[PDB]
Design a protein around this ligand. Sequence first.
Ligand SMILES: CC(C)CCC[C@@H](C)[C@H]1CC[C@H]2[C@@H]3CC=C4C[C@@H](O)CC[C@]4(C)[C@H]3CC[C@]12C
Ligand SMILES: CC(C)CCC[C@@H](C)[C@H]1CC[C@H]2[C@@H]3CC=C4C[C@@H](O)CC[C@]4(C)[C@H]3CC[C@]12C
Ligand SMILES: *[C@@H]1O[C@H](CO)[C@@H](O)[C@H](O)[C@H]1NC(C)=O
Length: 1941
Amino acid sequence: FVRQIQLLLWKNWTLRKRQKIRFVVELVWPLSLFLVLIWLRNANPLYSHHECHFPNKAMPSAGMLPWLQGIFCNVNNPCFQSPTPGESPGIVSNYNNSILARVYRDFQELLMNAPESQHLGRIWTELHILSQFMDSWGGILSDMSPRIQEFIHRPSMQDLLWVTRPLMQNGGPETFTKLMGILSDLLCGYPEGGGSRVLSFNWYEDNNYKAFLGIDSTRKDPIYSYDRRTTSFCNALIQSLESNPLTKIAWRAAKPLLMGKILYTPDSPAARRILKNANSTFEELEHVRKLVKAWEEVGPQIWYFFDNSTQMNMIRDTLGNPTVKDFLNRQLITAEAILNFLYKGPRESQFDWRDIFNITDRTLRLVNQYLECLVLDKFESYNDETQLTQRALSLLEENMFWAGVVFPDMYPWTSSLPPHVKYKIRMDIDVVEKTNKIKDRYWDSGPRADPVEDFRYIWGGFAYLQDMVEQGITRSQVQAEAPVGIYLQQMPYPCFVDDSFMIILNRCFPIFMVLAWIYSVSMTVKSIVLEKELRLKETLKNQGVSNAVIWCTWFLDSFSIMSMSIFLLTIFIMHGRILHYSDPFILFLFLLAFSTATIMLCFLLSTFFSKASLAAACSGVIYFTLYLPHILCFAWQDRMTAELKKAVSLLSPVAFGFGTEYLVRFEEQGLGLQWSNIGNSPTEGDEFSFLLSMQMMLLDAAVYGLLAWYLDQVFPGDYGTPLPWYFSFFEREHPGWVPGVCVKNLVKIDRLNITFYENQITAFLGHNGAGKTTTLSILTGLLPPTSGTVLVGGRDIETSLDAVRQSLGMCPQHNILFHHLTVAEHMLFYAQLKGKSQEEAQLEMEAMLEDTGLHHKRNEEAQDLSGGMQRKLSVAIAFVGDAKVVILDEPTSGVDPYSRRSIWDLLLKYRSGRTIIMSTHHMDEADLLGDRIAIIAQGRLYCSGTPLFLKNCFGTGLYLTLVRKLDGDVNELMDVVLHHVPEAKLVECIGQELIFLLPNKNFKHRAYASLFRELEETLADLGLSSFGISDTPLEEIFLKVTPGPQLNTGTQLVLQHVQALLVKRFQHTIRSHKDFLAQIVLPATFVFLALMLSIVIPPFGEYPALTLHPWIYGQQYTFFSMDEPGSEQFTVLADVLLNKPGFGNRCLKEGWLPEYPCGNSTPWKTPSVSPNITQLFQKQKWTQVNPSPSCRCSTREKLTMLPECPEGAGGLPPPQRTQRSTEILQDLTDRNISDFLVKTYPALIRSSLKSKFWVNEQRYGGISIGGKLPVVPITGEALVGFLSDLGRIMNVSGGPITREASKEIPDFLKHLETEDNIKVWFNNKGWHALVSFLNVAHNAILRASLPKDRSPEEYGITVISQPLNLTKEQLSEITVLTTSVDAVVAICVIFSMSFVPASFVLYLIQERVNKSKHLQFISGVSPTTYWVTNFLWDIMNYSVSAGLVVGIFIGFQKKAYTSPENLPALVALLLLYGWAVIPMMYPASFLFDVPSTAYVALSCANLFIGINSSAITFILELFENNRTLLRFNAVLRKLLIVFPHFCLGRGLIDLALSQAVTDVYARFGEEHSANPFHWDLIGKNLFAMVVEGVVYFLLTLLVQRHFKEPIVDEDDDVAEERQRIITGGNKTDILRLHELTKIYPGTSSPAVDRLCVGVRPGECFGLLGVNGAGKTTTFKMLTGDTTVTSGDATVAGKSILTNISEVHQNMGYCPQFDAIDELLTGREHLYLYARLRGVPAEEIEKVANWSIKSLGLTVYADCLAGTYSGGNKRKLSTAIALIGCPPLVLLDEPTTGMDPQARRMLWNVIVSIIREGRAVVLTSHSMEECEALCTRLAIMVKGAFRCMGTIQHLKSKFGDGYIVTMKIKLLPDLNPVEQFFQGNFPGSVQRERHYNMLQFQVSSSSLARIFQLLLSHKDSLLIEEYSVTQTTLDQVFVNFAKQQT
Ligand SMILES: CC(C)CCC[C@@H](C)[C@H]1CC[C@H]2[C@@H]3CC=C4C[C@@H](O)CC[C@]4(C)[C@H]3CC[C@]12C
Ligand SMILES: CC(C)CCC[C@@H](C)[C@H]1CC[C@H]2[C@@H]3CC=C4C[C@@H](O)CC[C@]4(C)[C@H]3CC[C@]12C
Ligand SMILES: *[C@@H]1O[C@H](CO)[C@@H](O)[C@H](O)[C@H]1NC(C)=O
């Protein structure tokens, strides 16, 4: 058994090594694919970021001073790493580190709190007040003098504020960068420089395709109109800012805020009150503007006082201090004197009062001029949403539109606010997040904190407006007890890494690893099915191998070659840095499991098929289709049950995907795939794991293998035996010969007995019906008998079947040769398989190689051997194993006679004790070879004996053959013959030949001897030329045992051709399954799938409204922080936040959304924690810097997506409550919130992160009550009074504006910055969380300030977001995606529609690869009419298919194509595309030569061409650049017209574009009436496509239309024929050749050389040929297939070179290789070829019936011609040849594979045709056929006719003498006869001698002497039986072939 595995393994390895080209691709293809994967890896670096804590962003309810800071210092979202001061429990300022803050802190720390400074100031103020009324001090001032000194001393001014601020003071500072650098430090102190902003890399989200393609199209530039009714200065300013590429996005994003408007619809007095109370910030800013403007007037008064007042007298007195008060000046002077000089001014020098006053003047005038044209009256009224939107578009096109507030509940007469007030905010969609989706689809592992594209509710202007409106509503409904502000504070985020690869390596790795093995699968299945197509599997099984061994060895071979590639690929992956952290061994095992599943899938796939090419073409596609469902099941894994998963894992490719998902997800989180963490579901309770996936793949492999084995063993091909679904006429036998196979008493339901002998080559003869096949089956081990015994040398079949199989060779009818194996390896392998050892096999192989004659091709491929040598090798390998019994089956079936003789020589050399048993159909072979023939018929063994015994037992008399030169008269021949022997019958007379018959009973020897003496002496006197005697041929014995109608021509004949071709095509297509499937099904299903995947995207209108509450995010955790519990208002605020109404609005008393009901709650439980954590926290005293165990980030070589980090992080869990709103609420009161969030978020997301699709983080925000922003201890009244008194002293009166601005100062001061605010933590990874929790906070603020007489469970504020309608550009940008999906649909449609003509080309190739096309061309059909009729049929069929596809399109009701104004365009496009694509692929039928290879190439080419020609032009049209894009696209668009597919692709795409544009203009409301057939849009495609189709057809017709030496010496007959042709050329010679000569190009050796013969009517000029002489060539160019080089071949006078149609109508071909359509019925072929031949229609039945009757075959007449066998096929071809009674009828091997009693019938018909008077021309290898039916043979050796003449004359001159065989009575009696022949006949070779019978070969023409001697000495020689014969014709041809070499 193991020997079988070893042999098959060695053979498979040898074959794989021999192929040598599949091997390289095998090893290279996956390496190239995964090198592409490596390059993808190396061009996608991973983004790693440090911990990220953010500052808080103030809101307009926190006063305009902090809010402004929070909109200038936080335009970048700094993201520091250390926590900001703003996240501390009770601190909100976040800016104690700016220069101003520190300086002011110092200013308090030495001045306000100073013990004596306040007293000194009060004293100075009192003294100043006294002096003004009039109109023991000084020591206090000196005491203050040191205090200001160290106020200067503190290092907030020595360096800071005096090394930074003066930097801009020298000259003009740079405008943009370092001014912001200094101002940021001057206003907000921020550590670590400024911090690094996080970026956003989710381009594919938000559906912003500009970023990926890199398109610099921002937005249309806003319309400019000079007159805004505003000062020209800032009209010029807008001119400047709207032009430069610098500061163009910033101004476009900031103009709405500073200058835009706010439009509110209801206009009711209540809305007016709401938006008057929501107006505070604008009053504040406008008050600041008034103050700045009033300084403009107050200033000149200050200057006038400073130079013109009593202060001049005071300054003069101070200058007089050296004359008055020098002591006081010197006590503390010169610096004061310098200030006094400045007071004096009139000084060129700098650093004086003039300079500081001038700089203050300049800066304040500049600030006033800049501020003077803001817009602080933003509120405009309207009446309904319609006018609001109509004005909103008009404003927005100018880019002055902030937002629009709409109250959906109050009519224009409303006066009292309802409890549940509701409003909506409408804005442009470039300013608000989209309102249809609430979460990013694929979870990026970032914080989503990039200020430009993540935050858009903040810089856009949503949150500010919402805060203003909600504080307005709050202050309107309730009183003003105390105001509290709102700070938004983004939640912190842990330290992440963003690996952009993992998305790619998720989906791509499966499909790449499947494409890696789409070639190996095809090769393996092709090999497996090819081994079974050529019947070698049956041969192997017969010799003894089991069925399991074949499967096991196929598996081992494939597994070895695949394992090599898997090892290479795994090393390549691991050391190419695609996977970073993974045990390579487990990855290798995973790949091996997939390979095993794939190999067993190949085993199963090979079971369905039976062809070779078809399997190789289709198996890879089947493999890919099997993989395909994993793509569908990849976006639905969040709803897919584990039970479903395991069930849908039955496909190995699908299982691969489910494993690589865990591969990538384990590689991403850092640990990677290792042994310990395998088989464990990474997510929580998936129950699906890697190890179980591998086990499922192994189970898949086992199931595939068992199913394949059962299916094959139950459904074998045409060759195996399917299993049930369940599973005196006999020569005396002289005792000398030892019996070899003594089968006796055999029965089967044959009833016979016969004993084959030791050495003699017994021939077995029969009709194949009554035996000779079943008997050979029982004799071998193939099949067991019933009630019989077959004794093979003493080992009965039933009893022993091991030794019998060991010692009985067998050669089947077909040869048994592996490809790619040399003869030596074949012979060694076949010797070993029988059972010898290795060395014995080598010795036997060498010896029998020497005995065979193939030793010179010792190492030559078994494909390069010629057919004769292949058959000889097969017969030789039937002799291996030293088999003492051999059973051939038709040796030398179709080999040329020389190889036939060679195989006979082999058989003679190996008959020494072998008991050969040949079963043959030929009769000469069974006679010249067999030593005893045994015939069986009816099941009876009729006779069996020596061929001499049969020829002399019931054999007819010896016939007589005579030939003349016409020139011999008949009467005298018969006269003399009958006079010598009066019992002679002239049995047959043919031209130039005469055949008699003479009996052998009363043999009358003297008369015979006289007859031959007379015919030899007087040979030439009569008309004779030669004569001979033939003994009864064995074929006769074996058989005995068991004029033309008128033809149409002209124009009716062409109509006959058209009708006949059309009917033939239709009748073939109507009865075929596969054409209909590839013609009606596949296009329909592909179009249907494309359309079904088209409508999956619903049409989009305008963005829907979406109310704003947190519970749109599902189930979540939200916390709070009760801080600063002293204040009663905050206590009741906390109570309202917790218990009374709930968190937001869900449990409102009256009602709320009906989809969100709320129930009861839980009484404030606390989670239970393991004692580990309690002991951990008790054992170590954690400081306040770190309260919880710090947990580790992603270090090097351990990069983790989120930091896995130990238990106990974040501290003990806080008490919880499942609130009424059904949202678990925690309570972080005395507990770091930032630290807790940071070290709790990882585990929280890990517990909820499966598939990373629409993931739900369990916490989205919370509200932290309490935060105290310190405020200055200055009241408004004191400040204004101080300024008023100061102005009173310095003679300052102001005026109107200084009074209108300095009158409302207390409210201005009170609204500046607020106090006791609250924080709103918000997780921004949910898009609408910020505004939602802002709304919740304001609801709480409202509900906490009620007057306690009204229940707080019914008051609330509800915000709704819904954007305006989209304009031109946004609508176009949306419609681009629909255009893209329609383009994909168009590509799929062209692919589906191109599936149709590929079948047409398939049929064309299948018909051309036979001779069917050429045979029709011979019958008389022009090329042009052939192609025209085929084109008409193809057009009609494609019209049917396109009508079906149009119907499918209509079914879907697609408005784009099926509109009544668009349907004609679709119909025309489809029909014309067929019209233009069919002629394009007509020429492709000439290139290929095998269906299932042309189809793949045509489909792939069509798909690729369409994809490129559509996608390239569409994408390039999407662009706008003109360099390398626009002109190149235009020139490319013109070139790509040459492809028909491009044309219809753009047709469909342009129809979609026109429909989209019309849809847009209908939505806004216009009319766009572009009809599709407009030349620019569609109509160039139709014109160009039609012209292209017309050009293609002409090109196809053109391609079909296109692509001396002196006479050497010869014998007498060839030269005589030459002269009979050249001179006195005959008139009646039907076919006359004239120096026909053809030389192959590039060989300089003539294939033929100057043939010259003519054939008379009634002369079967059989034309033989030595192998390679080119008889095929002379036929191929006599018909017309191959062009002629010289000479001319006239037929019935018509030449062949010039006019050929008459020749074709005057001849009838019969190709060697049968050419018939496998679907048309038997009678239909005759119908067809009769119609082409032109016999009229009314009598077609008569001719068809004559032809069907003449050839038998009448019972197979009406049946599909593919169901016939070889004999019936040849009969049909012959009947086709004789269809119209043509004068010349040119056959070529008429009878191959036919059995006697049928071959005779075909020969008879031919003989009758010959006798009618019409010539024929034969060509064959079976020389018995020629000798039977031809009358003028001619042998052609090397391009020339070696010999010509009648059969008898040829075998006279060329042939040797008569062969006389005779037997004596015993074996000793035979010796004496011999020397008698040695005496009288000196020339005597004994050809063969055997026991009791010796056959002399005497080369003596004078046979009369042999006759008279052998009948005078009949007694004395003891001669009982004898026979005289003559050297047959084959001997002559073998002599020729032998002398050739
Ligand atoms: C319009 C004229 C010229 C041509 C019409 C051709 C039509 C009739 C042909 C084209 C494809 C054909 C089908 C192809 C395959 C099959 C499967 C076979 O098991 C039954 C017949 C059936 C179902 C054929 C019915 C006839 C059919 C629909
Ligand atoms: C992906 C696309 C382009 C190709 C699909 C797979 C190709 C290779 C397959 C699918 C259908 C197959 C054909 C189905 C039927 C037949 C008829 C048969 O008498 C010859 C082979 C032939 C013509 C096959 C050739 C190979 C084939 C064309
Ligand atoms: C930070 O801000 C507040 C303001 O008083 C306070 O915590 C502290 O004084 C400031 N300075 C620090 C913490 O250095």
